[PDB]
Design an enzyme around this catalytic site. Sequence first.
Site, PDB file in Angstrom:
ATOM      1  CG  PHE B  25      40.524  26.020  39.103  1.00 44.59           C
ATOM      2  CD1 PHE B  25      39.518  26.969  39.057  1.00 44.59           C
ATOM      3  CD2 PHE B  25      40.591  25.070  38.097  1.00 44.59           C
ATOM      4  CE1 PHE B  25      38.600  26.973  38.025  1.00 44.59           C
ATOM      5  CE2 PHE B  25      39.675  25.068  37.065  1.00 44.59           C
ATOM      6  CZ  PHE B  25      38.679  26.021  37.030  1.00 44.59           C
TER       7      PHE B  25
ATOM      8  CD  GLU H  68      42.681  22.383  34.648  1.00 45.08           C
ATOM      9  OE1 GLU H  68      42.779  23.597  34.922  1.00 45.08           O
ATOM     10  OE2 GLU H  68      42.695  21.944  33.479  1.00 45.08           O
ATOM     11  CG  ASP H  69      46.578  22.700  42.172  1.00 42.42           C
ATOM     12  OD1 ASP H  69      47.311  21.768  42.561  1.00 42.42           O
ATOM     13  OD2 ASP H  69      46.691  23.875  42.575  1.00 42.42           O
ATOM     14  CB  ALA H  70      40.373  23.181  43.081  1.00 43.44           C
ATOM     15  CE  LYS H 219      51.599  27.166  43.889  1.00 43.80           C
ATOM     16  NZ  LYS H 219      52.891  26.509  44.222  1.00 43.80           N
TER      17      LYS H 219
END
Lengths: 67, 243, 104, 49, 45, 48, 45, 400, 50, 335, 50
Positions: B25, H68-70, H219
Amino acid sequence: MIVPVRCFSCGKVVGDKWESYLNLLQEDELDEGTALSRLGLKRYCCRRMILTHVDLIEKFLRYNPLE
Amino acid sequence: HYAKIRPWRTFRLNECVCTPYNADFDGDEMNLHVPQTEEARAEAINLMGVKNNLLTPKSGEPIIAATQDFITGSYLISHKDSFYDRATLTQLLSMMSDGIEHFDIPPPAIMKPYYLWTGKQVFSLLIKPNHNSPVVINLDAKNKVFVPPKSKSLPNEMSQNDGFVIIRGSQILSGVMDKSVLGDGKKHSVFYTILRDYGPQEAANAMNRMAKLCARFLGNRGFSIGINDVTPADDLKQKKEEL
Amino acid sequence: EEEPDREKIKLLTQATSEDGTSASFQIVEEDHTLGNALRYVIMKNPDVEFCGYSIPHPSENLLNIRIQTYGETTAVDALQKGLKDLMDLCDVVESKFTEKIKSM
Amino acid sequence: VKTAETGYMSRRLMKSLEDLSCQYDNTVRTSANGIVQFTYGGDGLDPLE
Amino acid sequence: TLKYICAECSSKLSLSRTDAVRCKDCGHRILLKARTKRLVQFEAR
Amino acid sequence: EVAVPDRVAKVLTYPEKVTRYNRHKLQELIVNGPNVHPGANYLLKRNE
Amino acid sequence: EIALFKYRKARLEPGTAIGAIGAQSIGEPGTQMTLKTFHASMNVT
Amino acid sequence: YQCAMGKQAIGAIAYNQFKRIDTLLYLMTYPQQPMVKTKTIELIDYDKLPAGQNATVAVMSYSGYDIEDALVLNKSSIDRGFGRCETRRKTTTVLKRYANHTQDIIGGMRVDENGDPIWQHQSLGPDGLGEVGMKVQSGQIYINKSVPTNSADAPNPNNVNVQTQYREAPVIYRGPEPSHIDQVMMSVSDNDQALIKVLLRQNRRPELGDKFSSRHGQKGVCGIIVKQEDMPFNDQGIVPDIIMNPHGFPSRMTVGKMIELISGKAGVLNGTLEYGTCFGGSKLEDMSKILVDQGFNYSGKDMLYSGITGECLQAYIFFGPIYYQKLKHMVLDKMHARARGPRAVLTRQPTEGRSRDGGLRLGEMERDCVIAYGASQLLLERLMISSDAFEVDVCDKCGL
Amino acid sequence: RMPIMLRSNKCILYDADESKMAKLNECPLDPGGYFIVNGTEKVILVQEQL
Amino acid sequence: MSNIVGIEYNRVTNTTSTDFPGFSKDAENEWNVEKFKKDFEVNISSLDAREANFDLINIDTSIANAFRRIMISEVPSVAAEYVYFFNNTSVIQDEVLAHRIGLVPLKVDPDMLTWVDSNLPDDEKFTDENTIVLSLNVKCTRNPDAPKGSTDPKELYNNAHVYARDLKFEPQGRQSTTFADCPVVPADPDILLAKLRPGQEISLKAHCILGIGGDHAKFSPVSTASYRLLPQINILQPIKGESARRFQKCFPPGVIGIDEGSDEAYVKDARKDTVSREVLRYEEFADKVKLGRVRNHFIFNVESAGAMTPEEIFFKSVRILKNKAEYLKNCPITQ
Amino acid sequence: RAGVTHVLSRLSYISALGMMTRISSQFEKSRKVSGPRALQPSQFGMLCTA
Ligand SMILES: [Mg+2]
Ligand SMILES: [Zn+2]
Ligand SMILES: [Zn+2]
Ligand SMILES: [Zn+2]
């Protein structure tokens, strides 16, 4: 640009506290934190926008279609 | 896998089926093709769908399973001290299986000195909620952090930190779940046992059921990393230079 | 214009087991406000044994409560007993607040 | 530096193993009806299940 | 209709067709069109 | 279940030919329009 | 009954493209490690 | 990973930022200075033109949309203008004279007589080129242009008819979202070739699919958008702007963000902007003395309540101000789809890339995967029926 | 003709401060160091060798 | 079970409600008129014209959440929505200045209006008391003297800084006798809306609509609304030593203190102490002082944007929760 | 020689200073060997390590 009228997280009118803040730091020079606490910005989210605020609308007025 | 029509314009899906795609994501975009004829549409879902391809071919291990906020919410319900009342338990069982489900509540862990269920009884209703649900799985599994017991006691579960998962009739009798009991890459898991015995449909149904509980309760409980847990507590700070 | 909002509460027939004693309901257009404030009141009914709200997806504007009770009570009647009871709670909070703001 | 070289490596390993399937007489055969194993792996069992 | 503000003298001057585009006061090359008289709406959102 | 948005689904289109179970559904859907989402874009006739 | 049912569903089904499965089964480049020895020489790939 | 991302975020490019007609540039409405000034970003004047906004982050596992990374954002903070954008594009054209002294003339304004004007000419103005604040949306013509259809080649100039033979060929705004015009401009080249540079701009709200930074190689796309009566509040009423997942801390080993939060939280409470330079800066020992003087925790972890149920959280939440950036790669520009469009001239394939039309590609390393399933009727569709199916007449004997 | 890159000895931006940069319509904070030919601005990436 | 929520050095405990029947063996206390009326007090503290402070005692965290969650979402307020520009020739882009007019608090009561009907065409819902028009008009001229100083243009140029008080009010054909005693002036007139230069000019007629804070946050009447459980400092092992003066260093200069001599270390009301747990990390001290908050005492500390007084905000927050139980009790259940 | 003059990247303020102050790539293309591609201890005061 110009200071935003309302804080992003808390949400109170803080854009009215920039002209009265700028004449309070130039004239009769206080500190930074005591000047930010004098105008009633207690919690740190309402303080970090008068504190931070890159002055950028004054730099963009050097050019004009008036000359 | 099946479509669904939604607001803001981005593709969005679950996180259990995220490890074979190697997605994170991050800003990574994926493309999406539709079938046009009946002959290829009826085989795209039947032998190529998600619920049939729960394993990998190279090993025989379940490839779509737990993710980051899936076992850290599953661990905090089971650390021998998460004791729940009636009112917290009914809210957990309601947020777990949002729509239609009956639950036929078991007797609590402790009687009259105040009625407090354990966390294993909250978690065992996720496997076999009804009286009509035929999921009567049972297994015996290790975990990663297993310290051995006192070496004189007989069983493999008298150890110090939860030891060894013993499920006997869709009820957990000992141990946290903790990664390769439902943890993406080893056998002898829960969702490997349901898939192996009671079809793929019940295994995909009981794994959708975990995601709602670990999505609502993990934010309801609170879990963070600060700065006071990366600092040495002055004994390591006294010892490291002299060693 | 006297239609009493048929698009409000829908008794989910696939969730009701006996035709009584266990029921799942479905609002339209609410949030977590009336969720916890009503399942606190329903849980004080001493004949129920399961109550809890749930929003299936925040992109929708829905919420599903489920009432399960013991014998000699209807799950529809346990909602109505706990929904009139929140009115008296909001009436007694409104009364004790306005008797002190006029004194100071 | 590694992923392109093993992308060329998994590409060529496909083509020599591409048309090779188990028949209905429990024997895996090639495309030209030539036989390679009389039973799969010496055992005849599914590696998945 | 009194448009085409010049880019250097900021003079509001209209030009005719079949002519070279320039400012008749000084002789500056580039020049930009005046804002419309019409109405436009926006939401405060 | 994957969840696609409401604009990709306006330009991703499936040929659903009409036979006795589609007919009462693809008639309420063909009056619905290409703009409203439970609708259709094209229509191929019997004579093609 | 269970031990014969699990062996019933264990033999290879006729028609599986198992050469194409085994071609990208062994093609898993997730190693990226360089082993060595200590208490040194004799490197080996 | 940050050095490839600091030169990628949107910002406050120059002082003459509004008097320039770059072909693509991103702006930002309310820029903010970083709270932790490095002692070398004061030399290169990064505090004059910054590239992001300070956000009161709260590192906690929340709502499940941040696995996951959001990271998840506040609805009522974007609603008040957190990180507003302005994409600004140029679509210039030139008009030139031909060999036989015949140039092209811009014009239009078909009043349509129960009309006034046509929807294609709705925002175009009486001159022929668009206005300085009218709205265009996906069909309107704004730079209407008409070339001569006879003097494109080089014949001799026939004096019986020279000018009055025109072919209308403008270029049409073809975009998903409506934009505005603000810098229509006319000039002249060296060889009297008049060119018109038009500048389009649109306001882009931070919505679901936009990515952000942390100045520390983190990110992350937007998880969801969620209201303010949600995300939890402290004793003073601070709700967070962005909630990050703590699982991105251990394997990435980025404890410099975990010093940045406590060094920026004491920088507000003292007032002075504090330093975060290499091999020095502001020490952590005389940092948290400001925290205990104000009335906060030593570690910067105050107890939060819950917005969805009211009761306090079981753990202590590490929350404070951390400067976040907003990058490129918005989901409005990455969105792409195609059903049945133009084909290729040579090989009759669906066309390549974006802005011609779509049609995406199934590689050689993808047909390897579908053979392993054994589905043979999906390869007839996804390689022959959908892409290129062409009937042909072959002969039985001596087959050609 | 020989195009001259910005802020050189043979340039107009040499010795400008706060009044000439605004009159000649250019930001006084850009690094310069670039050429501008055919409208677009272009740099020369410095090459290393042995 | 032990209503005081406990505070330790790395966790909290005893958080949940634990006040429902069927809990140990005896039912308690299901509704019992009037036991909830017998045990509900309120104590209004220092109440200004913009900020109100008051606490509610002996209620749970479900009905105190719902008042807070309504108070900034579901109460209606009024703000400018549609802006119609005429000759915006300033430096600011046309949506940025339209976004700043939405975020000003307009001091007018949202009881003298009706709701909008979002089905009609354009000239059918901007009629009487549903929409307020506000007109701005300003042009910058050069101050002809400009004697010696080059400063911000309050001396060099006339009205170069425009404010929130420039949003003038024009009454319509009906709302001129109803809005006669009170104008629709904004709450803070000194809001820097735009600064500009001569040759530039802005003029606009901005409409104004009534809405709730769930759609857009400009319709929220409250700056922030929250509560705070008051802590308590249970003191035991009353030895004082020299460490009693060290014990008043780790707290704010309010909550505790010492009398003549030292002799003990008492405590005043713990309404000033933010829970900072500084006395929980001293390795010789965690056996005599425990910290904890009370769960049933919620100190509301609400504020306002300027449109309404905060006791009216709380009164409207309580009243609209009772109306959304009316609307659910009086509806039929359709299977 | 091709690919030596690039258009100046103008995304933020520091992208114009990343196109400035940028040494390029010479030969020894280094497909598989990481000899001229890995970081060396010799570039301490110059040739920024990150
Ligand atoms: Mg990625
Ligand atoms: Zn604030
Ligand atoms: Zn001129
Ligand atoms: Zn032939």
